[PDB]
Amino acid sequence: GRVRTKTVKKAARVIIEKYYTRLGNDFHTNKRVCEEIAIIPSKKLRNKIAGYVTHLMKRIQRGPVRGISIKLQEEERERRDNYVPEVSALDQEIIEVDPDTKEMLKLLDFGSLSNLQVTQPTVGMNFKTPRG
Amino acid sequence: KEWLPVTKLGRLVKDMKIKSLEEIYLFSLPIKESEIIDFCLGAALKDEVLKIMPVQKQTRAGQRTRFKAFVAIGDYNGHVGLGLKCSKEVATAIRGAIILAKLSIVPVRRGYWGNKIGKPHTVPCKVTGRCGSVLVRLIPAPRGTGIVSAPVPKKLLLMAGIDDCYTSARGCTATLGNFAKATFDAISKTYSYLTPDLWKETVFTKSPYQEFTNHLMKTHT
Amino acid sequence: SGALDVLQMKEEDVLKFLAAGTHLGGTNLDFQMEQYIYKRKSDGIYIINLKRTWEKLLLAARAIVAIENPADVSVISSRNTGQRAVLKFAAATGATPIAGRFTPGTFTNQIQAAFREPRLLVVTDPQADHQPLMEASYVNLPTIALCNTDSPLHYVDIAIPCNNKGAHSVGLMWWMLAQEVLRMRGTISREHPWEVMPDLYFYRDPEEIEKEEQAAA
Amino acid sequence: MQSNAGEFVDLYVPRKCSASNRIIGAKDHASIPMNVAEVDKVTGRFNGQSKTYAICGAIRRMGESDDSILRLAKSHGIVSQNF
Amino acid sequence: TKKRRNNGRAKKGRGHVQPIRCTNCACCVPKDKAIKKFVIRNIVEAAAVRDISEVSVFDAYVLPKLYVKLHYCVSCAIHSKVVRNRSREARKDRTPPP
Amino acid sequence: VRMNVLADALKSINNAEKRGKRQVLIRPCSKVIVRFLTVMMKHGYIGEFEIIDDHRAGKIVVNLTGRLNKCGVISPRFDVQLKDLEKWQNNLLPSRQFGFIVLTTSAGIMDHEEARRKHTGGKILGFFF
Amino acid sequence: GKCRGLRTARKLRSHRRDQKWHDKQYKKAHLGTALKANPFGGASHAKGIVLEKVGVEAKQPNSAIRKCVRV
Amino acid sequence: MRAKWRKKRMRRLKRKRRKMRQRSK
RNA sequence: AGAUACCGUCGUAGUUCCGACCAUAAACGAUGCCGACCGGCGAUGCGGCGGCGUUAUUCCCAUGACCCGCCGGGCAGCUUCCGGGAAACCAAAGUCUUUGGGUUCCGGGGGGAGUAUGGUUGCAAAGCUGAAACUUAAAGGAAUUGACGGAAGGGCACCACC
């Protein structure tokens, strides 16, 4: 029966978004930081916070945290800011084109193209979910 | 008192960069600040409370009796509103409802009945307004009449500066909750009503979020 | 967009709208989508007329350019399909994104910290991202939507008819949207293709992030 | 707006819907200015002038804004006549 | 006040449907009005079937099922907890939960 | 059945205003409808229309703007003098600036104001503002 | 008026002439049943000889004797 | 009293009221 | 306690058919009827049309059984700031102070009372028509919060249990 309170959880989240630098994985490293970055009149309330901090400091190293938005999560977008892969689905020369879509391009400028491949329409039209 | 404003609409008001709230009723942009009204129309503003109505929700043991202040508002030249705020004491609701009255002050269209000569005196059409079952219907009158009405819908039509009017309240006007709002809606449907005056096609002049955008880029983030 | 040969649907553009799966529509038809549809296929699929896909997005780019401030144009995606697709628009264009969880009450409630008072909204799915549409209909906030054959044209002012359901169909319809705004503002010329790849905008499946280490090993 | 003299006698002339012609009230908050940026025939870029079409709140919840904005730009010289 | 849109029943263009009797009571409740259940069930449930396969002379004889279409009156359906009161929006769900 | 053509055809135009439809097909085409619609055209509340000729009663498609608030008929056809006309224009029109009661005078179908100039009343048709 | 027709004055007047009797104030002032049963008989006042005194008890929550007079 | 059984008691007594008018014929 | 009650066992008229009477029901959709107009969609029922294929008598077609849609009318449905309404709700209860498409019946605070009386039909029970005296500050509709239930479901506790 050890569920963290809102003066422990929020109080921890205010530290981590501000102080990602000073904290770490180990408790005793960032137990003593809470003497500097918090003015707490309670030894018990300190360990409750500083303990939950480390549990969230193990969650920035495995994923993102819910109530966080840091320079590392600006850096997270920065890494895939220009993620350019191998030539994707818009570098294809044989593409599946539906035959009745050949009519809606023939009416436009695009009668017959270079890098398409046509198919044939599917008889025995059975698409609907059976009623019930 | 400062009022360091929050909204983009209210940010332009304090700097005296919007000329008046005549643009605000053109672009239909919501006055969600209470110091835009006290800035402009606060000058000749007279705030009078209609009703003090306690309401009792039944609790486990005893009653929780709150109070309600139906506050009429308006300068005597072309603007009125109605504010309803429910609070547990008599000093909070009266102070609180004037703010919600100011947030919903509307322009009233006054004009002319019969010969269209002199000062604007009356409602320029037979507007209607109905909330609940109350049906207060405001008609243009001949000049120097006074508002021939009940104590309360006169009390708001006096505040508008609409001197000449013929009222015809219909339904349960006993409940002053529906009787102040229904008369208010009628003088909120004066500029909702297309008269042949308004046919000079409206060209869409530049919005104060477009007009003053460079002011709205280097005063905040 | 109207009988200009410069903003004509180019030869490089149709083969992106074929390969992505944007002509591939739904089985159900909203009555106000006959105005954006050619003809119903076999297997009950609606062909979105890809000229009537194109023509709308150009004015939708005129709309974003018509806003002088690039910042206040909010861009919305709560469904994962377009969360990255709207986020890559944000940095390039100079706009503000909503990449999952729009807080109901941001535009109306002042004293919420996230108080966007925007001037224009861009919406992925009107059904999924329905929450800002209401608040967009509570302040004078025009509504742009990347609509579909299934999605309604409700509370939206310009519709961009897409297949906004498919994974790689969404980000391509965001890339063409992101291009056309930067083209008009004065980044890109209509002689050369834009260097930024549309696959950048496609939302990467965390199932397929567990693959690429082995895929090209 | 005229009195018998002729001068503007009311305190503002309100907006009027570009789609339906029914006027836009002082607290119709669901109303929309909608500016469209003007494109040069050859350059393909913003000029400085702007193309404006407003719709009242009663039409956006009707679902006929993007039917009317479509027509307010089909034969006003923005979007293709064939379309 | 009109609690249900249909009048607690499922006739809309008849006026008269012949009543089939209750099973728990014998209340004359109309056909559409009655909460109808159709039971499709083994004649021995789960514990006895363990044994009777050894007493069955034939090569793995699958049992006959027992078919009861129950006709509940509304005072009987809610006595035996077949049906159940629902919230004002939950009322209108005609979807039978598996 | 349809017992008033000037009512049920102009009940059809008012639903197309309140919705906001650009044009409306009003199915009966009587001699009274055209000379009603013209007095809304000549005063310029509605745009122009055309009467579709089949070998039946015709059909009418009217180009509507949102300038028309309400087209309101009066049934039956009540006789109106010139002093009684003052009371009709009171309770049935909004302001005494805009809004017309059209009525079938001996001189032909025209608004109350032209019947006031020409000094000849008749049976009443309806109003429009 | 449910009927509005131009020659319907002999049903508007005749129906009004019928349904006015369902008005409880009208029928009271126009029958010979209420007029006769009035102890005064269409009078504003009346003299009368006192022939006993009645201490009439007050109706509901107010417990008091309303000292009245039989006349 | 149920409006049905009030109606029944008014009927039983109408049958009685008629019987105390029948004896004078 | 008592049940000329609920429960059980018998059981008379009744239930059944034919021939007459009777004319009333929560006869309810508690919503008159003919006409027009004003949203969307999935269904379905009947008729007719148009549209690939599947199987059916193969001996190819006429044609069913499916199948995609369309149209006409009916039975309801689903959604919606069309709009209304006191609300619950309703594409009708909408187009209604911005009040008139036509027409029938009918209501006028609660009781007294569908009572008295006459008239009238019925074999009778009773039906239709139908008051008044006197009486009274409410009767009521819808919804909200609580309390309560010999209502349903979910919790907590050695001042409960195991």
Side-chain angles (χ1 to χ4, degrees):
Chain A
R2 302 191 189 182
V3 189
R4 272 56 178 265
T5 68
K6 65 174 295 305
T7 61
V8 171
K9 282 194 181 291
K10 296 185 179 184
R13 286 188 178 99
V14 171
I15 298 166
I16 295 167
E17 189 169 335
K18 285 189 173 182
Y19 301 98
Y20 183 71
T21 61
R22 295 183 185 283
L23 307 172
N25 202 336
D26 192 56
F27 165 70
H28 296 277
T29 59
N30 64 352
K31 169 183 66 180
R32 290 286 183 178
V33 176
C34 294
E35 293 292 325
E36 302 298 321
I37 57 85
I39 311 163
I40 304 170
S42 167
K43 184 191 267 73
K44 200 175 271 73
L45 187 60
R46 190 271 320 286
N47 298 319
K48 289 285 181 71
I49 292 161
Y52 183 63
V53 167
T54 59
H55 189 70
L56 289 184
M57 289 298 293
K58 291 188 294 175
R59 275 175 59 187
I60 317 158
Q61 302 298 320
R62 205 167 64 261
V65 180
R66 175 62 62 191
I68 218 77
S69 57
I70 52 173
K71 289 187 178 183
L72 189 70
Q73 291 192 347
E74 190 177 356
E75 188 179 353
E76 189 174 11
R77 190 182 65 77
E78 192 180 2
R79 191 172 175 181
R80 289 183 184 175
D81 189 49
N82 299 122
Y83 173 77
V84 173
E86 188 173 12
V87 285
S88 75
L90 304 186
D91 183 32
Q92 292 179 345
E93 295 189 349
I94 298 297
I95 313 161
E96 288 193 347
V97 181
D98 186 79
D100 282 312
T101 69
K102 194 64 179 177
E103 290 291 322
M104 56 85 74
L105 286 181
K106 192 170 74 173
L107 289 170
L108 309 183
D109 190 34
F110 299 102
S112 58
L113 273 303
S114 185
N115 53 355
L116 294 183
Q117 183 62 47
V118 78
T119 190
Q120 47 80 42
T122 64
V123 83
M125 178 169 56
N126 197 184
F127 59 90
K128 297 188 170 178
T129 307
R131 280 72 166 268
Chain B
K1 281 74 178 175
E2 184 176 11
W3 174 66
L4 189 62
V6 176
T7 55
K8 191 178 287 183
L9 199 284
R11 187 59 187 176
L12 295 177
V13 170
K14 190 177 175 188
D15 299 307
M16 288 83 159
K17 292 185 175 177
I18 192 169
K19 67 177 183 175
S20 185
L21 53 73
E22 296 297 336
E23 278 191 345
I24 297 170
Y25 298 143
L26 177 60
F27 296 105
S28 311
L29 283 161
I31 307 168
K32 288 174 184 167
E33 304 293 353
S34 191
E35 288 80 2
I36 294 172
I37 294 90
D38 197 51
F39 188 76
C40 324
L41 293 178
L45 202 66
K46 294 174 188 179
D47 321 333
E48 300 185 356
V49 184
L50 300 173
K51 194 185 189 68
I52 304 295
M53 184 182 162
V55 283
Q56 298 190 353
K57 84 174 289 295
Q58 189 63 54
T59 65
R60 183 170 302 172
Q63 290 73 219
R64 178 77 293 285
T65 315
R66 278 177 290 171
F67 296 89
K68 196 179 272 74
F70 295 91
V71 180
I73 190 159
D75 64 320
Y76 297 177
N77 196 0
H79 302 95
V80 282
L82 201 284
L84 83 133
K85 185 59 183 178
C86 185
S87 192
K88 294 186 179 178
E89 58 267 27
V90 72
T92 305
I94 293 175
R95 183 174 293 115
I98 298 158
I99 288 168
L100 290 185
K102 286 174 179 170
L103 262 67
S104 189
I105 60 165
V106 303
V108 305
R109 190 181 167 78
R110 73 160 64 81
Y112 299 92
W113 180 75
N115 195 8
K116 202 178 287 184
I117 187 166
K119 289 181 175 290
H121 63 95
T122 190
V123 185
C125 50
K126 291 182 183 180
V127 286
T128 187
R130 48 171 303 157
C131 70
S133 199
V134 177
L135 191 144
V136 182
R137 183 264 201 107
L138 308 179
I139 304 165
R143 296 170 174 281
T145 312
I147 302 98
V148 180
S149 199
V152 166
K154 175 172 186 188
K155 208 167 289 297
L156 275 91
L157 285 174
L158 276 179
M159 278 184 179
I162 298 160
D163 185 54
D164 296 301
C165 185
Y166 285 132
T167 72
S168 189
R170 187 260 190 283
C172 184
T173 67
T175 62
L176 200 52
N178 306 129
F179 190 42
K181 290 181 190 181
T183 189
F184 164 60
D185 183 36
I187 57 184
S188 310
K189 285 183 75 178
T190 61
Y191 283 119
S192 192
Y193 185 64
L194 183 272
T195 59
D197 284 317
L198 264 291
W199 285 349
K200 176 178 177 178
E201 65 272 31
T202 300
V203 296
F204 307 106
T205 193
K206 193 172 287 189
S207 181
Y209 297 157
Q210 191 178 0
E211 181 66 44
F212 295 87
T213 189
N214 278 322
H215 184 268
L216 298 170
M217 123 127 260
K218 64 195 177 189
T219 193
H220 69 272
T221 309
Chain C
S1 180
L4 275 70
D5 210 58
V6 178
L7 292 171
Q8 185 60 234
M9 193 180 188
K10 210 177 290 174
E11 198 270 350
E12 288 83 14
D13 307 337
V14 174
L15 302 162
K16 290 183 169 61
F17 291 171
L18 282 171
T22 62
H23 72 268
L24 177 67
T27 307
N28 300 122
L29 181 59
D30 176 45
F31 76 114
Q32 293 291 339
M33 300 299 303
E34 292 185 349
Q35 65 202 346
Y36 302 136
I37 282 168
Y38 169 65
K39 187 172 170 70
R40 189 181 187 280
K41 296 185 181 175
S42 185
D43 200 51
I45 303 167
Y46 282 100
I47 304 163
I48 307 171
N49 203 166
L50 287 175
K51 187 171 181 183
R52 287 181 270 186
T53 299
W54 182 258
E55 288 286 326
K56 294 306 303 290
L57 190 140
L58 296 185
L59 198 147
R62 288 170 170 263
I64 299 160
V65 168
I67 312 304
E68 185 164 2
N69 188 15
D72 57 1
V73 176
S74 185
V75 188
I76 315 167
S77 196
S78 73
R79 275 184 64 239
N80 288 309
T81 326
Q83 287 185 23
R84 181 179 170 171
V86 299
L87 189 58
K88 299 302 175 194
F89 182 93
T93 314
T96 310
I98 305 170
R101 188 54 185 151
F102 173 79
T103 303
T106 54
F107 308 154
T108 319
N109 196 332
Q110 279 92 249
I111 323 168
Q112 293 190 36
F115 183 65
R116 276 79 68 78
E117 183 163 8
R119 202 193 149 196
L120 184 53
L121 279 70
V122 191
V123 175
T124 307
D125 194 5
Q127 302 181 343
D129 312 331
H130 74 94
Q131 200 61 39
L133 301 185
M134 287 20 164
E135 279 90 44
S137 193
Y138 289 152
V139 200
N140 293 87
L141 305 176
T143 302
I144 307 177
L146 282 289
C147 302
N148 205 340
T149 63
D150 199 55
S151 298
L153 298 192
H154 308 354
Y155 293 101
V156 310
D157 305 317
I158 202 77
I160 306 157
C162 311
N163 186 23
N164 66 355
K165 189 171 179 182
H168 310 293
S169 66
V170 162
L172 179 266
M173 291 306 300
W174 283 105
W175 179 70
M176 281 284 179
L177 197 143
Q179 277 219 265
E180 193 61 30
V181 292
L182 289 175
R183 278 192 188 286
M184 286 182 58
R185 285 182 184 184
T187 299
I188 318 161
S189 185
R190 297 175 188 282
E191 303 301 328
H192 303 274
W194 188 39
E195 187 174 10
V196 176
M197 199 172 174
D199 200 280
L200 178 69
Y201 287 25
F202 300 173
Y203 177 73
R204 284 187 70 183
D205 193 0
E207 178 263 310
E208 286 185 343
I209 303 167
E210 295 174 354
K211 191 172 181 180
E212 205 276 330
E213 190 181 358
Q214 189 178 2
Chain D
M1 300 80 75
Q2 295 95 6
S3 103
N4 259 14
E7 196 60 34
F8 298 162
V9 88
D10 64 328
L11 41 79
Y12 84 102
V13 182
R15 274 185 303 157
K16 194 172 69 168
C17 178
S18 193
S20 74
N21 205 171
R22 288 179 289 173
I23 73 171
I24 298 164
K27 297 186 178 288
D28 191 11
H29 303 297
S31 300
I32 23 135
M34 200 106 142
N35 285 285
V36 175
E38 272 298 314
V39 173
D40 196 0
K41 66 180 183 178
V42 60
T43 315
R45 290 177 184 174
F46 173 56
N47 303 136
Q49 69 185 348
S50 235
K51 186 67 69 178
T52 175
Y53 298 114
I55 286 168
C56 74
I59 301 167
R60 296 181 78 183
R61 69 172 60 87
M62 200 160 61
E64 306 303 328
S65 48
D66 54 359
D67 177 71
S68 64
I69 292 291
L70 191 269
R71 293 177 306 91
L72 277 174
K74 180 177 69 173
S75 7
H76 280 265
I78 311 301
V79 197
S80 184
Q81 287 137 308
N82 208 151
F83 182 66
Chain E
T1 188
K2 188 162 186 179
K3 187 156 176 285
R4 301 181 177 77
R5 183 163 207 176
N6 58 346
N7 298 314
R9 64 199 301 161
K11 73 173 186 66
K12 293 300 299 178
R14 283 81 197 163
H16 182 80
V17 284
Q18 284 79 226
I20 314 169
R21 305 296 293 278
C22 195
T23 52
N24 200 346
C25 297
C27 197
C28 291
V29 150
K31 184 175 184 174
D32 65 333
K33 181 52 178 290
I35 292 90
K36 306 178 297 297
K37 295 193 75 171
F38 180 55
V39 179
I40 54 171
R41 188 186 66 187
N42 292 118
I43 61 103
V44 282
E45 51 183 351
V49 69
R50 178 74 175 82
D51 307 322
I52 301 154
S53 59
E54 293 294 329
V55 230
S56 67
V57 191
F58 312 140
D59 184 48
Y61 180 65
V62 67
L63 291 159
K65 302 173 181 178
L66 200 141
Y67 294 93
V68 175
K69 190 169 178 67
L70 291 162
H71 301 289
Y72 285 88
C73 82
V74 182
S75 58
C76 291
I78 310 163
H79 182 79
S80 55
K81 296 180 177 173
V82 160
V83 302
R84 188 162 292 164
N85 55 334
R86 289 186 288 177
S87 69
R88 287 174 303 100
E89 276 195 336
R91 295 192 200 283
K92 300 174 185 180
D93 295 314
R94 299 183 71 257
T95 65
Chain F
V1 290
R2 186 186 305 98
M3 296 190 183
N4 196 346
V5 170
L6 203 269
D8 289 312
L10 301 188
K11 195 173 293 297
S12 181
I13 79 159
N14 199 11
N15 300 147
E17 283 296 341
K18 286 187 177 180
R19 182 56 66 103
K21 304 295 189 191
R22 278 286 301 279
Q23 66 183 343
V24 56
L25 175 59
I26 55 173
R27 290 177 44 241
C29 180
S30 193
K31 197 179 293 176
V32 189
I33 305 182
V34 175
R35 292 292 173 183
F36 192 103
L37 288 172
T38 46
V39 185
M40 291 203 289
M41 176 198 288
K42 297 289 275 195
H43 284 288
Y45 281 8
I46 67 165
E48 67 165 321
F49 66 99
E50 57 86 42
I51 66 175
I52 299 171
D53 183 54
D54 48 1
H55 286 98
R56 286 87 178 169
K59 291 183 176 180
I60 307 174
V61 181
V62 181
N63 296 125
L64 295 178
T65 65
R67 287 184 166 182
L68 187 64
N69 295 314
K70 188 168 193 161
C71 181
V73 75
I74 298 296
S75 185
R77 301 170 189 281
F78 298 99
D79 54 339
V80 187
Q81 280 78 354
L82 270 298
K83 285 190 265 69
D84 295 327
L85 188 61
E86 182 62 38
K87 299 187 291 179
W88 280 101
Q89 70 171 343
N90 194 174
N91 57 359
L92 204 54
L93 297 174
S95 186
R96 285 194 70 255
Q97 277 300 314
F98 78 96
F100 305 95
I101 297 171
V102 81
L103 67 102
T104 166
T105 69
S106 68
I109 298 165
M110 54 195 178
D111 61 328
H112 74 103
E113 188 179 358
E114 196 173 11
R116 187 65 65 80
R117 287 195 189 88
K118 293 178 180 178
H119 192 70
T120 300
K123 295 186 181 183
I124 204 162
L125 295 169
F127 66 91
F128 62 95
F129 65 79
Chain G
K2 190 54 63 80
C3 71
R4 292 173 192 160
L6 196 264
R7 308 162 74 184
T8 68
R10 69 166 53 268
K11 198 169 177 64
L12 284 184
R13 195 175 64 182
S14 76
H15 185 236
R16 185 58 52 221
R17 191 172 66 233
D18 292 345
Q19 295 299 329
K20 205 165 286 185
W21 292 85
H22 294 97
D23 204 349
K24 195 176 287 180
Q25 289 81 348
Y26 181 81
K27 189 155 185 186
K28 182 168 65 180
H30 290 89
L31 278 184
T33 61
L35 179 53
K36 191 57 184 173
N38 190 14
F40 280 7
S44 63
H45 293 269
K47 282 178 72 176
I49 293 168
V50 174
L51 50 80
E52 66 178 13
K53 298 185 288 182
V54 180
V56 175
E57 297 296 334
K59 190 175 176 72
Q60 199 55 229
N62 309 308
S63 70
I65 301 169
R66 302 277 174 258
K67 284 81 157 63
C68 301
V69 169
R70 177 63 78 185
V71 162
Chain H
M1 173 65 75
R2 197 207 279 189
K4 194 172 172 181
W5 306 140
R6 181 50 66 88
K7 185 169 180 175
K8 187 157 178 60
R9 283 190 66 206
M10 293 308 299
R11 275 177 170 178
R12 289 174 185 173
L13 193 267
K14 278 166 73 187
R15 297 192 72 170
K16 192 182 293 295
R17 277 174 174 169
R18 280 189 299 173
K19 193 64 184 291
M20 294 295 150
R21 286 170 59 79
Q22 187 269 330
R23 297 182 65 188
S24 308
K25 287 197 173 179

